[PDB]
Design a protein around this ligand. Sequence first.
Ligand SMILES: Nc1nc2c(ncn2[C@@H]2O[C@H](COP(=O)(O)O[C@H]3[C@@H](O)[C@H](n4ccc(=O)[nH]c4=O)O[C@@H]3CO)[C@H]3CC(O)(O)C[C@H]32)c(=O)[nH]1
Ligand SMILES: [Cl-]
Length: 396
Amino acid sequence: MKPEDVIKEQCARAKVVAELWHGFTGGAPKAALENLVVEFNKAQQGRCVRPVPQGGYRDLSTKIKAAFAAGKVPTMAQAFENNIALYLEAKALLPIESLGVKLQGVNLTFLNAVRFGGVVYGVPFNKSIQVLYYNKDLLKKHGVPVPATLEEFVAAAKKLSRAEGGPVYWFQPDASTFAYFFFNLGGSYLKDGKLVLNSKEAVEALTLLQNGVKEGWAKPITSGAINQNLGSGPYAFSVDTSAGYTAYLRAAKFDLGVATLPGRTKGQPGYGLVQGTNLVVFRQASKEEQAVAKDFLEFVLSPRAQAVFATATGYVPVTEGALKDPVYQAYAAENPDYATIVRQSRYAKFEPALAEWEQIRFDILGQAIKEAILNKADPKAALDRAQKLAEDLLSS
Ligand SMILES: Nc1nc2c(ncn2[C@@H]2O[C@H](COP(=O)(O)O[C@H]3[C@@H](O)[C@H](n4ccc(=O)[nH]c4=O)O[C@@H]3CO)[C@H]3CC(O)(O)C[C@H]32)c(=O)[nH]1
Ligand SMILES: [Cl-]
């Protein structure tokens, strides 16, 4: 009796059913969402949510565009900030505060990100922050302090790779990893309102990674998640989503470290990329489905729902209330990595919220990073190409 079995039964006897389309394909996010929905549905009187997996996040946005085309949309769905921008062009989204959902206490880092022209269009739900995952045992073995600066991080990666005979910093050659180096070398994607992929800081970020590959301290991972490659050769450090925390804990055969990210100086942690999603409510949904979404959105913002969800996953509890819940506190008191994730969430950057950003981050910027890392393309020539494809798509 999988939670999804329970839910299908709950929905089969419900008077009213609001679909929630998501992009959790498995593991702890998928288990945590479904357990939340089972609990919500037991409380309700013939009024249920039905989570519908749509694949990953891009499958989900593709399926949502086909839904507008078909005229069959869900009540709710997961959405990045760029997805929200897109669906607003379509006039598809219900303003949240119209349902009377109370948003005070939601972290302004996340609340600001769902606000378009003053209006909130999303409920921050599963929001993650990059952290530094590390191998405590391997750093102790070579007397390496947890690096607090980008300088110390390069140094440690070179020191440990020399000692162990192989690259100890592991990375996915993607926009998400790029963003960490880009932000903390003083990059910004927007200059005088214009999207710029090929700035000096972008070239310096992509150069740093490619030189790490050439020098033997950076290891590109091209098959599975980082946590799925552990046990193959020496590992000291990744920069990865907090939402992988439970997966790291399960897979690591070594004592797993979580730290705040290396910054430019010791005066502050580096910035982590905010990932994960918001829940949106579609205007096309029935008044009755909307009422279910309003109770569901209130439930998901409750201290207990956030304390259970965040502690099952490593996602960042989106409310001040969740940190004051005793189930959170019990987990935090036993595992310092939960406070570490919250501390890192204070130092948080977003990618641009342009309608076209999902296509750019994957098919243009992501590609130019793969070209440099995996095919030895010159970092500037790869980014100049990206900039030109992005300027051509935005002109379309
Ligand atoms: N479509 C679309 N995706 C976007 C956008 N901005 C960023 N991202 C993607 O968000 C993922 C991070 O979202 P987050 O919820 O923090 O983490 C994910 C999973 O990463 C994480 N997980 C699961 C199993 C595992 O072994 N390891 C693990 O880390 O669990 C969560 C739910 O699956 C990155 C991954 C990416 O697909 O390569 C590209 C990134 C965008 O605009 N659009
Ligand atoms: Cl699974």
